[PDB]
């Protein structure tokens, strides 16, 4: 071959062989999910443990985007770290020029077209990571999973990272039991669970749950961090589920 | 030997780089159709949600464009986002500096030249996408223009894209020897749905719910996609008959 | 400087007189004002000179380059749509006021287009110098349904009243016909008012009243093989 | 091996070479240790030099009145890492009135690596830092990682031979973070954390470099003679 | 403002300048040259605002004398003439113009000719039998059109001279405090010493 | 000031029965004092004929401006550039420089080869065509020559009479002017040949 | 990012050949066959409108196209690289030559601006050379009719007729039995008809022959009759009636 | 990223010499002979050339020689495509030293600055070089008539005759045998085609395989007169020297 | 010029002049004031001619990008773009704006734009130079949530004194009517508002 050894240079197969391997530096990364609640959104992340050095509860691997999304992504943290940034910029000049807040579904195009442009020329690298962001607006909740083709699709429930076989599955039993919708109160109970129970490929080392949700009647549309005796609750039920 | 990893004329005067970007095309499974009635012009394409968690609405491949031309794509979808983005601005471009809604040629015309600046500098990989245009033109009614990454396009009473083409094709070559016209004349538009959806079940062989098709019609005055209701429609009336 | 633009049923009329003035000293007599942006979009400039003169070419070239990029009749809104746009980014320094009418698919229009970028649409137009006098013709016998004929002998009308009552406007009338799917017909030197009467006495002197000094003869060819 | 040329090339596996070598930079570089309390931070250095007639490289850069870091590897990248955020920290204090938050400055570490090993032609940066510091909300010690990665830990060590300083501190984690108050005895907590490390080169006075900023405490650097209290 | 004086007889041209300065009400300094020598040939004056003259004299003079340097040929004094008012003619244009006006006198060596060019400074170049700028040309173009003669040799052109100069003594309003001259020909470039 | 009003000169150009003439006045001043009499306004690039007044220096620019466009035309294309042609490219140069403009006035004269069609074009300071069938005046007496030409002037003269009239036209409106004399030349254009006569006039 | 396209992609190689030119010129021998005959008073230009499918439409699609009024333009090689030049093409016969003169270029020195389009693709940095060779006809009023063909190089001749193309061997022989100099335009055009018809295989007839001449003056497409220092277009396209009417009278 | 595919051709070889120039030498043996003949009184260029048919046109044709203003002609040797280019910043460049100092341009000034042009195309940029050489044929006043050779490294030499094109060794050696001092304008159009008779690839010499100019001293009053000679006075000058 | 906006019950109603003055000379006496910049949000132009046009037609191609990327605009956006090019660019173009604009969801809305670039949501707005003449007559007449047989009355009484009373108003009225039903036209000649 020799296709892959830069980027953007197609192969005989039509793969672009840089691409293919920036989708395992996101298998190699933590594990995330999100629930599409009826009314909301549910974020949730797997923070490992590396040291008992680590101060707990400040290294916390959710963002925010403006003041009504919530990201979250699997992979190489830098590289994430730097679409965010980017992204805070794209909904502020948005927020500028309009005065009203980005709808979901376009925040949605405009973080693609940064990442596809890392795919036409040859000398900057495809982004290692995928992105599952989305919140609240005007028409109500919206669920996105971004890959480093620059494919993006809605979702009833999305996952990434090493654990997401399992989650995939894991999510598909809560979509089938409840086409009613699983309300937003019930989803912070089942985030954690799904967690717990795809922690058990990495359950070598202890981990952190950290939880955050957007939800139309809890926070008025905000994006909040889920904390003290709500995330509390939730632990307690996935502790009770696994044993 | 590195002209199969930029665009430079082989030693034989092929380019390498372009004759691969058809191949990327045609891995997506879907089968496009896009045929000309008398006063409209319909676009009938699968769609495939793999997994139920992927919601079934966002997923879709026809564009609008401007008003009144819509642009199914058949390729990779992060492609189609490109080329979708870049042909939408060149329709408000254009109603601002001349005062008129771009004519579907005009735009067909456009994206053609955009394509060629690619295979022409080394520093960019072609698109890997076919791109459909389909109007009703003020001028010359009823139109189809299909461009490729090459840079070519051309004219068309009626095309299909896909791995599967070569069903299609020869099933509206036979249509159209039957008819000696150059369009189908049955003069509302929904006749001439029905008539396209007939033509796709019989060349892959299979039948269709509501849920695998996403339909594009353009009348006069407006573009406008069918609903999961307005597609059941149709498909209850052909069962019918 | 007087110009008017008359509608009609079936089609657009388009009429100047042939002065051109530099201050108070008539430059031409005859020079017309009439140009022709493309084939059935005419217009007719007012003010600077050479604003119009250049500022139709300046189009010209644009509109026929876009019209074999589309491969269609250049319409009438294109011409109006970038004409507009050219004044505008200039603050109205140029000082260019033109009549744009013409025909195309779409039908008739007729335009006026101020130096700073204002334009107006109208069924009958009057732009210039004497444009108050021609305004008044205009106003009194402009009736819908004009016919083909009635319309040219409106429109002229109107500019011979600039020429008997203004100083600027002068010399002869030009007319330009546009009907819809006929080529333009333009009629150069439409109307003589007025002929300039024979000379009283003929002036013409013998040979040999100039003095010279000196003859040479300037050389204006290649120099050739001996 | 192959892919290894530029910054710009995934391996078959996902890893980026380029940016595993810049981190062998720093396992070159010599041992520094860092750790804190809630009241203070505490950096203890390893001061390198060359033949008895050099003198020892200074290992500890004073980043304004209440942040400073130390560095361990390659001593131009740490000058063009300390130099930028100095410049936020003034920044900072001219158009906001307000002394740079840690939590802070982490992060723009983290954004402007980011930038530097995607771009063709830059090139990793081959440094690590503690980055030490005394805000509004309080005490606060980072890693920094060429890749990219800011971490805030209790305690930490980069350098050689680092293993042994950074196994010590978490048996000892319970007693070192309850130093609260004394400012003396977490400075020689963190002495006998570094002796872990060092194999050879017994601690001098000339050798050894302390910083410690804190509640009551702008940031301050002690070398030479000042260092015969803790050993 | 300050008086410059060309007269162009058979075989030399004759260049004359005054030397005073006036900067402030004083008279500052009273014997400074006001002209710079291109080439063994051409010799050019200048007159005009203050402190842009030396500018714009020692700039002409570098490019000149890279020219000489380059072709080890002496541009002719047609050629240079053509220079100076390129220059001046880009000036007028830009931000701050070059308010200067220069008598060049050359003699050319190619056909044995002497010859004299007045470009002012709007950048007009004209060849004249003999010029000047300011009011000077007001005082003597009167006296020279009655006594030159072509045919006169340098020693009958110094005598029309010193009594254009006593023309302006009388009628001038400022002092300029007696010329220095200096003649261009065949020879070189000599000071004639007295008045 | 007036940038025109500063050195003067007039020129006039009149038709004939196969034959152009353009003939002007040799003056070069600045305002009330006289420098030169050697100045000619009236120059030739193949055999088309321009004559500029206004602003002396621009009048030495745009000689030497339009004997470079020409040059370069006279080598692609091997042939004379015509004067119909030439009189587009006349305006168009100078419109490039629409603000803050060249202070000119040409005027343009010649016979096209192909057709035998003696051909003459007037201008002003932005750069307008003056067509005219009769004959172009320019200058700062424009106002004299407009009223002199336009009486003597009866359409076809033959070479030699036509050399008369432009000659009344020209010595008059100069001694009624506070700008212009010193001689005048007089350029007599056929397809053959071109005929210059210097005039002998006032010197007051 | 840091682009260094500045390198050209061609390269003189050790043979004294320019690489990348060469290929260009097999990928030449590979288009549509297309042929010119210059006559007395005026060109004829002509091709096989090759149609892909029987869906397609080739009346949309053109190989033959309008520069000015008075030059028209045919090609042999790739589609896309065609179609790009002729808009770079009538775009700097205006802003470069019709402006600044007021009149269309004389057509050989258009040919001089297009040869030298040319050049900048294989002498500047990141472009490979063209993929085609133009025959440009036309007619300007001191040379008369003339007719050029312009190279991937860059490089461009005058002919007295000529072809290009998979065929290029077999016309240009049998073009030279049958010219001389007294061909009229009516005579010169069934010399052309005859020499397409060994070349093409498949069908030929109006709807799929393109054939164009730079001819006598037209007043009909002027657009604006009534003024008599204006003569219109001597280019005009035969249409596809006009077509099979001189294959009856084959 | 586009490290690879650098060519990074203006970098010297191991023992010197720039590889792109030592080809561009070996690219222009091929195109057709061009001579020029220096007599006291003018100067001669002959060029044999190079694609012909009974079915090219000819008489219009100009593909070696080309006239570049009124007192200076130069002959081309390589790619036609790439010397165009070279001539019209030559052109241009002659025309704006008329326009500031009223003198046409000395021979020895036009030259030097195409070879500057040349040379600095191989010092950076990456760029491949021009494949052209010229003889600058051209009379000024300073010195009387001169002749130039250039080469795509950029020198530049002074030459009483010489050729470039093909057969330049074959070519050179007969030029040194017949050229003599005294020789006059008649004498030298003898010779230059008696060279192009024997290193001819041609079965014969023929006037529509020939490009033939003169520079004449000749030519009313002191004035040169170029000539560009018609195809059809090169068939009399071809039954002249009776070589048909 | 004199134009007003006036919401009501089931939607919005633009009203304005159409005389165009250039000193005391009347230039075009039927100019089209109540310009279209997308399918239900319409605006009225007031101030230099020259200025307000380069304004709308910026808005115009701002507003046809936005809708094929995002989905329908609300009143509120346009009203923000408008706002974005009268205050960038304050020093010379000196634009007066009024956006009425019609949703399904919030019925009627009037924005105001004056010649600094301030936006303001309100329940009617005049603007123009003949506005001075009526304000007292709009504030005493107007009422919430009029019939649409009664609210153009109220605008047509409005405009018929601040023609009489300027001279720099006058010829006939138009209305654009913006309802869910879509777009009406209405028109006044002189002789059925004068006689009143």
Not at chain 6, 137 to 166: H, K, R, W
Request: proline letters at 3%.
């Amino acid at each position: 071959t020799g296709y892959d050894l830069s980027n953007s240079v197609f192969s005989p197969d039509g793969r672009n062989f840089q691409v293919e391997y920036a989708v395992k530096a996101v298998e190699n990364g933590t594990t995330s999910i999100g629930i599409k609640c009826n009314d909301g959104v549910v974020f949730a992340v797997e923070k490992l443990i590396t040291s008992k050095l680590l101060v707990p509860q400040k290294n916390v691997k959710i963002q925010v985007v403006d003041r009504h999304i919530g990201c979250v992504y699997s992979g190489l943290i830098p590289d994430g770290r730097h679409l965010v940034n980017r992204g805070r910029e794209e909904a502020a000049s948005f927020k500028k020029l309009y005065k009203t807040p980005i709808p979901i579904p376009a925040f949605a195009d405009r973080l693609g077209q940064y990442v596809q442009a890392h795919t036409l020329y040859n000398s900057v690298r495809p982004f290692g990571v995928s992105t599952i962001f989305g919140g609240v607006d005007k028409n109500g909740a919206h669920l996105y999973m971004l890959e480093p083709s620059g494919s993006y699709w809605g979702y009833k429930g999305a996952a990434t990272g090493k654990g997401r076989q399992s989650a995939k599955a894991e999510l598909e039993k809560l979509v089938d039991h409840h086409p009613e919708g699983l309300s937003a109160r019930e989803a912070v109970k089942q985030a954690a669970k799904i967690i717990y129970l795809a922690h058990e490929d990495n359950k070598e080392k202890d981990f952190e749950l950290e939880i955050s949700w957007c939800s139309l009647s809890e926070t008025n549309g905000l994006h909040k961090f889920v904390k003290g005796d709500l995330l509390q609750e939730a632990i307690d039920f996935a502790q009770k589920e696994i044993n | 030997g590195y002209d199969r990893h930029i665009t430079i004329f082989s030693p034989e005067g092929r380019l390498y780089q372009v004759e691969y970007a058809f191949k990327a095309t045609n891995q997506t499974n879907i089968n496009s159709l896009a045929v000309r009635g008398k006063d409209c012009t319909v676009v009938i394409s699968q769609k495939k949600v793999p997994d139920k968690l992927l919601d079934p609405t966002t997923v879709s491949y026809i564009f609008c464009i401007s008003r009144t031309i819509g642009m199914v794509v058949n390729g990779p979808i992060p492609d189609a986002r490109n080329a979708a983005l870049r042909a939408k601005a060149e329709a408000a471009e254009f109603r601002y500096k001349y005062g008129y809604d771009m004519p579907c040629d005009v735009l067909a015309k456009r994206m053609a030249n955009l394509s060629q600046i690619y295979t022409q500098r080394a520093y960019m990989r072609p698109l890997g996408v076919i791109l459909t245009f389909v109007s009703v033109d003020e001028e010359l009614g009823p139109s189809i223009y299909k461009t490729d990454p090459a840079g070519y396009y051309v004219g068309y009473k009626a095309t299909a894209t896909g791995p599967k083409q070569q069903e299609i094709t020869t099933n509206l070559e036979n249509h159209f020897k039957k008819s000696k016209i150059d369009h189908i004349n049955e003069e509302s538009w929904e006749k001439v749905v029905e008539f396209a959806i007939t033509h796709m079940i019989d060349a892959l062989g299979t039948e269709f719910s509501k849920n695998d098709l996403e339909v594009g019609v353009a009348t006069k005055d407006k573009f406008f996609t069918l609903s999961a209701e307005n597609i059941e429609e149709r498909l209850v009336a052909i069962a019918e008959q | 400087t007087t110009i008017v633009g008359v509608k009609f049923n079936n089609g657009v009329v388009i009429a100047a007189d042939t002065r051109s003035t530099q201050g108070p000293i008539v430059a031409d007599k005859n020079c017309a004002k009439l140009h022709r942006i493309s084939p059935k979009i005419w217009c007719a400039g007012a003010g600077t000179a050479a604003d119009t003169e250049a500022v139709t070419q300046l189009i010209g070239s644009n509109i026929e380059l876009h019209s074999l990029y589309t491969s269609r009749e250049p319409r009438v809104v294109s011409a109006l749509q970038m004409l507009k746009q050219h004044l505008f980014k200039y603050q109205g320094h140029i000082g260019a006021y033109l009549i744009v009418a013409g025909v195309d698919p779409t039908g008739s229009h007729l335009f006026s287009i101020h130096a700073h970028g204002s334009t107006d649409v109208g069924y009958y137009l009057s732009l210039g110098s004497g444009s108050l006098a021609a305004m008044a013709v205009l106003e009194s016998h402009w009736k819908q349904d004009l016919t083909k004929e009635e319309a040219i002998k409106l429109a002229s009308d109107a500019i011979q009243a600039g020429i008997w009552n203004d100083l600027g406007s002068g010399s002869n009338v030009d007319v330009c016909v546009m009907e819809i799917g006929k080529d333009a017909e333009y009629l150069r030197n439409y109307l003589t008012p007025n002929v300039r009467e024979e000379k009283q006495k003929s002036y013409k002197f013998p040979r040999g009243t100039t003095a010279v000094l000196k003859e040479s003869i300037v050389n204006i060819c290649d120099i050739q093989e001996e | 091996n192959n892919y290894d040329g530029d910054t710009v090339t995934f391996s078959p596996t996902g890893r980026l070479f380029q940016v595993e070598y810049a981190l062998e930079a720093i396992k070159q570089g010599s041992v520094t240790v860092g750790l804190r309390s809630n009241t203070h931070a505490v950096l203890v250095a390893l001061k390198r030099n060359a033949d008895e007639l050099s003198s020892y490289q200074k290992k500890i850069i004073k980043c304004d009145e209440h942040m400073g870091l130390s560095l361990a590897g390659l001593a131009p990248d740490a000058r063009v890492l300390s130099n930028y955020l100095r410049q936020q920290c003034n920044y900072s204090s001219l158009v906001f009135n307000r002394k740079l938050a840690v939590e802070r400055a982490g992060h723009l570490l983290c954004d402007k690596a980011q930038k530097n090993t995607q771009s063709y032609g830059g090139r990793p940066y081959g440094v690590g830092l503690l980055i030490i510091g005394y805000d509004k909300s309080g005490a606060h010690l980072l890693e920094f990682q060429p890749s990219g990665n800011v971490t805030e830990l209790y305690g930490t060590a980069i350098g050689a031979r680092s293993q042994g300083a950074k196994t010590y501190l978490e048996r000892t984690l319970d007693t070192f973070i309850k130093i609260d108050g004394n400012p003396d005895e977490l400075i020689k907590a963190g002495v006998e954390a570094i002796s872990q490390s060092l194999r050879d080169e017994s601690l001098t006075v000339d050798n050894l470099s302390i910083a410690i900023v804190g509640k009551d405490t702008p940031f301050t650097i002690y070398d030479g003679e000042a260092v015969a209290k803790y050993i | 403002m300050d008086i410059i004086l060309g007269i162009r007889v058979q075989d030399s041209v004759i260049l004359a300048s005054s030397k005073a300065v006036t900067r402030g009400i004083s008279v500052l300094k009273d014997s400074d040259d006001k002209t710079r020598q291109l080439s063994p040939h051409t010799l050019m004056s200048f007159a005009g605002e203050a402190g842009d003259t030396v500018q714009f004299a020692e700039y002409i003079q570098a490019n000149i004398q890279l020219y000489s340097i380059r072709e080890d040929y002496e541009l002719s004094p047609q050629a240079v003439s053509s220079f100076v008012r390129q220059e001046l003619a880009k000036s007028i244009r830009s931000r701050r113009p070059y308010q200067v006006n220069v008598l060049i006198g050359g003699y050319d060596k190619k056909k044995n000719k002497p010859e004299l060019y007045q470009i002012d400074y709007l950048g007009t170049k004209v060849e004249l039998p003999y010029g000047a700028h300011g009011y000077s040309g007001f005082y003597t173009f009167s006296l020279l059109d009655h006594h030159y003669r072509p045919d006169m040799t340098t020693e009958e052109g110094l005598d029309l001279l010193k009594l254009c100069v006593q023309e302006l003594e009388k009628r001038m309003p400022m002092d300029f405090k007696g010329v220095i001259v200096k003649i261009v020909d065949k020879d070189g470039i000599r000071q004639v010493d007295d008045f | 000031s007036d940038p025109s009003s500063i050195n003067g000169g007039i020129v006039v150009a009149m038709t004939g029965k196969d034959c152009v003439a353009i003939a002007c006045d040799l003056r070069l001043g600045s305002q009330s004092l006289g420098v030169s009499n050697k100045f000619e306004k009236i120059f030739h690039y193949g055999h088309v004929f321009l004559g500029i007044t206004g602003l002396a220096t621009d009048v030495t620019t745009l000689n030497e401006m339009f004997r470079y466009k020409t040059n370069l035309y006279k080598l692609k294309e091997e042939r004379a550039i015509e004067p119909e042609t030439f009189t587009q490219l006349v305006s168009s140069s100078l419109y490039e420089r629409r603000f803050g403009p060249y202070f000119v006035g040409p005027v343009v004269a010649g016979i096209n080869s192909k057709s035998g069609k003696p051909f003459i074009a007037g201008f002003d300071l932005i750069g307008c065509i003056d067509e005219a069938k009769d004959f172009i005046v320019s200058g700062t007496a424009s106002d004299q020559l407009f009223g002199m030409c336009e009486s003597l002037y009866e359409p076809n003269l033959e070479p030699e009479d036509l050399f008369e009239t432009i000659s009344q036209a020209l010595l008059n409106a100069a001694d009624r002017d506070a700008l212009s004399g010193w001689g005048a030349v007089v350029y007599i254009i056929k397809k053959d040949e071109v005929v210059k006569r210097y005039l002998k006039m006032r010197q007051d | 990012m840091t682009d260094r396209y500045s390198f050209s992609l061609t390269t003189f190689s050790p043979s004294g050949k320019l690489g990348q030119i060469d290929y260009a010129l097999t990928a030449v021998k590979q288009g549509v066959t297309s042929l010119g005959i210059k006559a007395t008073n005026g060109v004829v230009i002509a091709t096989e409108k090759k149609s892909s499918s029987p869906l397609a439409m080739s009346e949309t699609l053109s190989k033959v196209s309008l520069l000015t009024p008075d030059i028209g333009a045919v090609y042999s090689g790739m589609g896309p690289d065609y179609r790009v030049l002729v808009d770079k093409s009538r775009k700097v016969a205006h802003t470069s030559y019709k402006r600044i003169y007021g009149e269309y270029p004389p057509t050989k020195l258009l040919v001089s601006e297009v040869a030298k389009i040319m050049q900048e693709a294989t002498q500047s940095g990141g472009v490979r050379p063209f993929g085609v060779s133009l025959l440009i006809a036309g007619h300007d009023e001191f040379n008369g009719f003339s007719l050029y063909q312009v190279d991937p190089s860059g490089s461009y001749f005058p002919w007295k007729a000529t072809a290009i193309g998979k065929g290029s061997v077999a016309a240009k022989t049998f073009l030279e039995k049958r010219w001389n100099d007294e061909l009229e335009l009516e005579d010169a055009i069934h010399i052309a008809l005859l020499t397409l018809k060994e070349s093409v295989e498949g069908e030929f007839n109006g709807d799929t022959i393109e054939l164009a001449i730079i001819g006598d003056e037209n007043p009909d497409l002027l657009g604006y009759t009534g003024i008599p220092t204006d003569k219109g277009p001597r280019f005009r396209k035969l249409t596809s009636q006009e077509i099979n009417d001189r294959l009856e009278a084959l | 990223g586009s490290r690879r595919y650098d060519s990074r051709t203006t970098i010297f070889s191991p023992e010197g010499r720039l590889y792109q120039v030592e080809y561009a030498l070996e690219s222009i043996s091929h195109a057709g002979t061009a001579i020029g003949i220096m007599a006291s009184d003018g100067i001669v260029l002959a060029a044999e050339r190079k694609v012909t048919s009974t079915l090219l046109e000819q008489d219009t044709s100009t593909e070696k020689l080309y006239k570049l203003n009124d007192k200076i002609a130069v002959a081309v040797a390589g790619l036609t495509a790439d010397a165009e280019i070279l001539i019209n910043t030559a052109r241009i460049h002659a025309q704006n030293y008329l326009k500031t100092y009223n003198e046409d341009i000395p021979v020895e000034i036009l030259v030097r600055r195409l070879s500057d042009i040349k040379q600095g195309y191989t010092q950076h940029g990456g760029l491949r070089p021009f494949g052209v050489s010229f003889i600058y044929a051209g009379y000024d006043d300073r010195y009387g008539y001169q002749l130039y050779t250039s080469n795509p490294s950029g020198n530049y030499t002074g030459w009483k005759a010489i050729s470039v094109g093909a057969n330049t060794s074959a070519a050179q050696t007969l030029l040194q045998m017949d050229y003599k001092d005294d020789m006059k304008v008649d004498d030298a159009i003898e010779l230059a085609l008696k060279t192009l008779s024997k290193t001819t690839d041609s079965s014969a010499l023929t006037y529509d395989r020939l490009e033939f100019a003169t520079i004449r001293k000749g030519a009313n009053d002191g004035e040169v007169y170029q000539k560009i000679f018609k195809p059809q006075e090169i068939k009399d000058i071809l039954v002249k020297t009776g070589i048909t | 010029t004199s134009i007003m906006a006036v919401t009501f019950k089931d939607g919005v109603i633009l009203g304005a002049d159409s005389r165009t003055t250039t000193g005391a000379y009347i230039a075009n006496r039927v100019t089209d004031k109540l310009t279209r910049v997308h399918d239900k949000i319409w605006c009225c132009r007031s101030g230099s001619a020259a200025d307000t046009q380069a304004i709308a037609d910026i808005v115009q191609y701002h507003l046809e990008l936005y809708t094929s990327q995002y989905g329908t605009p609300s009143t509120e956006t346009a009203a923000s773009v408008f706002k974005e090019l009268c205050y960038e660019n304050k020093d010379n173009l000196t634009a007066g704006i009024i956006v009425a604009g019609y949703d399904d969801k919030n019925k009627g809305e009037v924005y105001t734009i004056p010649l600094g670039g301030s936006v303001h949501k309100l329940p009617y707005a005049i603007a123009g130079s003949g506005s001075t003449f009526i304000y007292g007559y709009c504030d005493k007449n107007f009422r919430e949530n009029m019939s649409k047989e009664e609210t153009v009355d109220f605008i047509k009484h409005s405009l018929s004194q601040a023609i009489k009373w300027d001279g720099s108003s006058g010829g006939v009225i138009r209305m654009v009517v913006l309802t869910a039903a879509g777009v009406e036209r209405l028109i006044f000649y002189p002789d059925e508002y004068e006689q009143l």
